């Protein structure tokens, strides 16, 4: 947008807020991934234990 028509609008602020909120959501989803993987590993451990017992 040329010269003086470049303006600071509520649109700008809304988009920036979107970006920042988005990074936060990104991080939280990754954390959930971490915990789920831990749970899966533990369950496989007990599965192996049980088969040996059998």
């Amino acid at each position: 947008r040329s010269n003086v028509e470049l303006c600071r609008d509520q649109t700008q602020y809304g988009l920036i807020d979107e970006v920042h909120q988005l990074e936060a959501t990104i991080n939280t989803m990754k954390q959930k991934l971490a915990q789920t993987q831990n749970a899966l590993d533990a369950l496989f451990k007990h599965l192996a234990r049980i088969q040996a017992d059998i």
């Binding site: 947008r1 040329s2 470049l6 303006c7």
Partner: protein
């Protein structure tokens, strides 16, 4: 003479606002599943004229 200069200045302003209309309607037209959508260095920047509302 004075009215001549007024004519030219008003024409300039008109074409500038037409530019702005073109750009922002193109933006709104853009939506999800686009061909040129990419990532750019530091979009959070501020430009170098910084006019208030």
């Amino acid at each position: 003479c004075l009215l001549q200069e007024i004519r030219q200045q008003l024409n300039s302003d008109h074409r500038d606002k037409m530019e702005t209309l073109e750009i922002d309607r193109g933006c709104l037209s853009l939506n999800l599943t686009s061909p040129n959508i990419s990532l750019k260095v530091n979009p959070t920047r501020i430009p170098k004229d910084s006019t208030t509302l």
